[PDB]
């Protein structure tokens, strides 16, 4: 016998389609190849493509699919349709699998609504733990959407029991609105900034800020994005940049590698796809967790009995027998995925026991610690803590030096020819620069003070010079 | 909704809860018929709908009103308490204000059990 699985995706159709359809096909083909899971049954599916929005058409497709009947449904990807989809699934006792976060049903939790993605409050206490490890009492966080506070709510509660002070900013829709805000960031000196935003924005956010050039060793940057590899990788700065973030995609266990590079070679064999800046060929979180959900379907399937096709109406309310048994057996589904260890609490279908590996840039990578739900911040690596005889990053910065005219420290050289460059002067200071550069390599150029004084107060509380 | 459509009316009132309001809007704009909403509904931030009739006051207006009052009374040290993260969607910009100014703002949260809020 064969198994029927149905999936509907709502996406714009005026560019090449979403890639998770291809990932789903790859997963089902791969499990069809392997007979070590289930030899007497092979997965079969009908794929349906519809334009996004217009949840009425989604209801029509749901009726068409239940006319055939399957064991689970994938999609839709918009919150509007999924409400009615879960309502009808509860009406017909059909368990539903989803691969994207939606607004949680706190008024009444549906028994049939199963999602595999780390929670926003999960990221919230994870970032609580990491900021407490870094012991900083002044940080600035900024988001772009009303759901970002759902990710950073416990950071908002942090002052209620700590001495932390928070500087929260908001990003208005469109990528042209960050230009004023970064100017105010110039006006007010802060170095501890958090960008709580989707990964699709992070590429051009980094591009813009490097266009201004605010990444220096003065600044420490952290993103709420759970994948740093997928983002554009231009950060090979010899100026020193503090970049930190999460990682959930496993890279070790060379079987996992074989999976990731077979995906990477199957992506490139197709004609190139234009992108916004994100590197194409490496795993994305949504498709990886969808792959894990396909394997959830498989592990649910091998213990289930033979499939029985059913004919029903979306306007009818007669339950179908096997829905409860697949729901119950899926409730105790346990496996190890690309995102890591998967299990479900016995009170909800939300994913649990999440893996969050912090990863930082220093190879212009390294293990520091992990976080897990059954404990706190597991500090795995204590770091090797290198110290160098000469501490400079290959001397790739022009030092800004401001000076004034005073004998014998600074004076014009005795010559009758026009003066140019950084050698229009001489003195003890220029010496100090030359031996410091020789002993500790670094670049600099001379600038004159526009004021012409050392600096003093004016009774206004503002210094000068 | 199907029963009302079969019966035939000019418009639909409610429901109070937005969970059913989303579906009501789905059917109503399926055949493009006006529907009026009673209170706040989460705006469609991916698609545009011209059938959105909400008479509930805007979050932006009340937020700018309260920032106006707090700036008028000119208190430089204030605190704010909110029932949950859902609360902050009304007062985004009150706590954005110390960007242009220097208000020392303090933030705390109400638990789901408000009958015993004596600790906080």
Q: Report the alpha-carbon distance of residue A367 to residue A358 in Å, rounded.
A: 8
- Asked if A290 contacts A28 with a C-beta cutoff of 8 angstroms, the reply is no
**Tokens found for residue B102:** 């220097």
Q: Report the alpha-carbon distance of residue A55 to residue A80 in Å, rounded.
A: 7
Q: Which of B47, B85, B92 has the CB atom closest to A170's CB atom? A: B92
Cβ A168–B108 below 8 Å, yes or no?
no
Residues of chain A contacting B98 with CB distance shorter than 8 Å = 167
Could you tell me if residue A376 is left (phi over 0), alpha (psi between -120 and 50 degrees) or otherwise beta? beta
Residue with tokens 């007062």: B91
In three-state secondary structure terms, B50 is: coil
Q: Report the alpha-carbon distance of residue A418 to residue A301 in Å, rounded.
A: 85
Q: Report the alpha-carbon distance of residue A388 to residue A385 in Å, rounded.
A: 10
Cβ A156–B88 below 8 Å, yes or no?
yes
Counting one residue from chain A and one from chain B, the pairs whose CB atoms sit within 8 A come to: 63
Alpha helix segments (H runs only) across A111-219: 120-133, 148-151, 153-161, 178-187, 199-212
Alpha helix segments (H runs only) across A216-366: 254-268, 285-303, 322-331
Q: Which of A447, A438, A412, A445 is nearest to A426 (CA)?
A: A412
**A167 reaches B (C-beta below 8 A):** yes
Q: Report the alpha-carbon distance of residue A151 to residue A235 in Å, rounded.
A: 26
Comparing alpha-carbon positions, the chain B residue that sits nearest to A104 is: B19
| Euclidean distance between the first and the last CA atom of chain B, given in angstroms as a whole number | 45
Among A144, A149, A185, A313, pick the best mutation site for testing chain B contact (most B Cβ within 10 A).
A149
Among A52, A91, A160, A174, pick the best mutation site for testing chain B contact (most B Cβ within 10 A).
A160
In three-state secondary structure terms, A246 is: strand
Q: Residue A227 carries which DSSP code?
A: B
Find residue B106's DSSP bridge partners: B79
- Asked if A319 contacts A111 with a C-beta cutoff of 8 angstroms, the reply is no
Residues of chain B contacting A55 with CB distance shorter than 8 Å = 23, 26
Q: Which of A59, A157, A170 has the CB atom closest to B109's CB atom? A: A157
Q: Which of A49, A69, A67 is nearest to A57 (CA)?
A: A49
Among B41, B49, B103, B107, pick the best mutation site for testing chain A contact (most A Cβ within 10 A).
B107
Q: Report the alpha-carbon distance of residue A24 to residue A29 in Å, rounded.
A: 9
Q: Residue B13 carries which DSSP code?
A: B
| Euclidean distance between the first and the last CA atom of chain A, given in angstroms as a whole number | 85
**B77 reaches A (C-beta below 8 A):** no
Q: Report the alpha-carbon distance of residue A90 to residue A65 in Å, rounded.
A: 16
Q: Which of B26, B96, B120 has the CB atom closest to A84's CB atom? A: B26
Calculate helix-pair angle for A55-68, A79-91, nearest 10 degrees: 30
Cβ A167–B99 below 8 Å, yes or no?
yes
Q: Report the alpha-carbon distance of residue A109 to residue A102 in Å, rounded.
A: 13
Q: Which of A368, A149, A132 is nearest to A245 (CA)?
A: A368
The CB density around residue A116, as the number of other CB atoms within 10 Å, is 23
Cβ A145–B45 below 8 Å, yes or no?
yes
Q: Which of A175, A155, A154 is nearest to A165 (CA)?
A: A155
Calculate helix-pair angle for A20-33, A254-268, nearest 10 degrees: 120
- Asked if A97 contacts A72 with a C-beta cutoff of 8 angstroms, the reply is yes
- Asked if A271 contacts A251 with a C-beta cutoff of 8 angstroms, the reply is no
- Asked if B12 contacts B4 with a C-beta cutoff of 8 angstroms, the reply is yes
The CB density around residue A389, as the number of other CB atoms within 10 Å, is 4
**Tokens found for residue A91:** 């009406």
Q: Which of A7, A12, A22 is nearest to A99 (CA)?
A: A7
Contacts for A349 with CB less than 8 Å, ≥ 6 apart: A111, A112, A113, A114, A115, A331
Q: Which of A84, A166, A184 has the CB atom closest to B107's CB atom? A: A166
Q: Report the alpha-carbon distance of residue A209 to residue A151 in Å, rounded.
A: 23
In whole angstroms, how far apart are CA A440 and each of A255, A389, A409, B10? 46, 10, 22, 82
Q: Which of B27, B98, B109 has the CB atom closest to A167's CB atom? A: B98
Residues of chain B contacting A173 with CB distance shorter than 8 Å = 45
Q: Which of A226, A234, A244, A231 is nearest to A276 (CA)?
A: A231
What is the Cβ-side half-sphere exposure of residue A283, based on CA atoms within 13 angstroms? 26
In whole angstroms, how far apart are CA A244 and each of A131, A360, A413, A454? 11, 4, 48, 39
- Asked if B54 contacts B41 with a C-beta cutoff of 8 angstroms, the reply is yes
In whole angstroms, how far apart are CA A36 and each of A23, A40, A304, A329? 21, 11, 16, 20
Q: Report the alpha-carbon distance of residue A281 to residue B25 in Å, rounded.
A: 40
Q: What is the structure's resolution, reported in angstroms to one decimal? A: 8.0
Q: Which of A107, A55, A47 is nearest to A79 (CA)?
A: A55
The CB density around residue A395, as the number of other CB atoms within 10 Å, is 14
Could you tell me if residue A463 is left (phi over 0), alpha (psi between -120 and 50 degrees) or otherwise beta? beta
Residues of chain B contacting A153 with CB distance shorter than 8 Å = 84-85, 109
**Tokens found for residue B25:** 């809007």
Contacts for A60 with CB less than 8 Å, ≥ 6 apart: none
Q: Residue A17 carries which DSSP code?
A: P
Cβ B26–A80 below 8 Å, yes or no?
yes
Q: Which of A62, A32, A34, A37 is nearest to A48 (CA)?
A: A62
- Asked if A280 contacts A267 with a C-beta cutoff of 8 angstroms, the reply is yes
Experimental approach = cryo-EM
Q: Tell me whether strands B52-54 and B35-37 are parallel, antiparallel or unpaired.
A: parallel
Among B19, B26, B80, B87, pick the best mutation site for testing chain A contact (most A Cβ within 10 A).
B26
Q: Which of B46, B47, B85 has the CB atom closest to A149's CB atom? A: B85
**A160 reaches B (C-beta below 8 A):** yes
Contacts for B109 with CB less than 8 Å, ≥ 6 apart: A153, A156, A157, A160, B81, B82, B83, B84, B120
Cβ B107–A78 below 8 Å, yes or no?
no
The CB density around residue A143, as the number of other CB atoms within 10 Å, is 21
**Tokens found for residue A225:** 């994005």
Q: Which of A45, A83, A89 is nearest to A66 (CA)?
A: A89
In whole angstroms, how far apart are CA A29 and each of A293, A294, A311? 15, 11, 27
**Tokens found for residue A258:** 């074989």
Q: For residue B105, give how far its alpha carbon lies from the nearest alpha carbon of chain A (Å).
A: 9
For chain A, the C-alpha Rg in angstroms (whole number) is 29
The CB density around residue B39, as the number of other CB atoms within 10 Å, is 13
Q: Report the alpha-carbon distance of residue A337 to residue A355 in Å, rounded.
A: 11
In whole angstroms, how far apart are CA A43 and each of A26, A95, A115? 12, 18, 22
In whole angstroms, how far apart are CA A132 and each of A103, A107, A138? 28, 33, 11
Q: Report the alpha-carbon distance of residue B118 to residue B116 in Å, rounded.
A: 5
Q: Report the alpha-carbon distance of residue B44 to residue B92 in Å, rounded.
A: 18
Contacts for A35 with CB less than 8 Å, ≥ 6 apart: none
- Asked if B97 contacts B103 with a C-beta cutoff of 8 angstroms, the reply is yes
Q: Report the alpha-carbon distance of residue A73 to residue A21 in Å, rounded.
A: 14
Q: Which of A57, A4, A63 is nearest to A316 (CA)?
A: A63
Strand ranges in A84-137 using DSSP code E only, listed in sequence order: 96-98, 113-115
Strand ranges in A2-132 using DSSP code E only, listed in sequence order: 2-11, 42-51, 73-74, 96-98, 113-115
Could you tell me if residue A347 is left (phi over 0), alpha (psi between -120 and 50 degrees) or otherwise beta? alpha
Cβ B107–A160 below 8 Å, yes or no?
yes
Q: Report the alpha-carbon distance of residue A246 to residue A348 in Å, rounded.
A: 25
Could you tell me if residue A298 is left (phi over 0), alpha (psi between -120 and 50 degrees) or otherwise beta? alpha
For chain B, the C-alpha Rg in angstroms (whole number) is 20
String of DSSP letters for A339-405: TEEE-B-TT-SBB-S-EEEEEE-----EEEEEEETTSSEE----------SS--SSS--EEEEEE--
**Tokens found for residue A128:** 């609580």
In three-state secondary structure terms, A422 is: coil
Q: Tell me whether strands A377-378 and A366-372 are parallel, antiparallel or unpaired.
A: antiparallel
A195's enclosing H/E stretch is strand A192-196
Q: Report the alpha-carbon distance of residue A98 to residue A302 in Å, rounded.
A: 20
In whole angstroms, how far apart are CA A428 and each of A405, A406, A407, A453? 12, 10, 9, 19
């Amino acid at each position: 016998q064969v198994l029927r699985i149905g999936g509907i995706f709502e996406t714009v159709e005026n560019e090449p389609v979403n890639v998770e359809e291809l990932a789903f096909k790859f997963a089902v083909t791969s499990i069809n190849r392997n007979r070590t899971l289930m030899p007497n049954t092979t997965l079969t599916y009908d794929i349906q493509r519809i334009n996004l929005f217009d949840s009425f058409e989604a209801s029509r497709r749901a009726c068409d699919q239940l006319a055939l009947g399957v064991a689970a449904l994938f999609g839709p990807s918009h919150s509007s349709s999924v409400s009615a989809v879960q309502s009808i699934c509860n009406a017909l006792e059909v368990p539903h699998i989803q691969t994207r976060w939606k607004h949680p049903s706190v008024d009444s939790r549906d028994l049939f609504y199963i999602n595999l993605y780390p929670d926003y409050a999960a990221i919230s206490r994870a970032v609580l733990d990491l900021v407490l490890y870094y012991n900083w009492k002044t940080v600035t966080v900024v988001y772009e959407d009303s759901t970002g506070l759902i990710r950073l709510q416990e950071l908002i509660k942090a002052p209620s029991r700590y001495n932390i002070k928070i500087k929260i900013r908001q990003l208005p829709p469109a990528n042209k609105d960050a230009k004023p805000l970064l100017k105010e960031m110039k006006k007010s000196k802060e170095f501890y900034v958090i960008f709580d935003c989707s990964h699709e924005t992070a590429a051009e956010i980094l591009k813009q800020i490097l266009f201004m050039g605010m990444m220096t060793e003065y600044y420490h940057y952290f993103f709420t994005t759970l994948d740093l590899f997928a983002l554009d990788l231009e950060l090979y700065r010899y100026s020193g940049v503090n970049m930190t973030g999460f990682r959930l995609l496993n890279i070790d266990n060379p079987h996992v590698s074989s999976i990731i590079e077979k995906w990477s070679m199957e992506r490139l064999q197709a004609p190139p796809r234009p992108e916004t800046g994100l590197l194409d060929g490496m795993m994305t979180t949504e498709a990886a967790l969808m792959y894990d959900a396909v394997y959830m379907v498989a592990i649910a399937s091998h213990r289930a009995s033979q499939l029985t096709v059913s004919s029903l109406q979306c306007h009818r309310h007669k339950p179908w027998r096997l829905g409860p048994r697949f729901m119950n057996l899926i409730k105790e589904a346990r496996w190890d995925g690309l995102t890591g260890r998967i299990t479900f609490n016995k009170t909800d279908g939300l994913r649990k026991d999440f893996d969050l590996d912090i990863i930082s840039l220093k190879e212009e990578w390294k293990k520091i610690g992990i976080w897990n739900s059954n404990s706190g911040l597991n500090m795995t690596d204590g770091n090797r803590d290198r110290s160098n005889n000469i501490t400079d990053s290959l001397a790739n910065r022009t030092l800004i030096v401001t000076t004034i005219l005073e004998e014998p420290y600074v004076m014009y050289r005795k010559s009758d020819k026009p003066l140019y460059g950084n050698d229009r002067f001489e003195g003890y200071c220029l010496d100090l620069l030359k031996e410091l550069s020789n002993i500790l390599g670094f670049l600099y150029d001379v600038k004159l003070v526009p004021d012409g004084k050392y600096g003093a107060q004016n009774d206004k509380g503002e210094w000068n010079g």
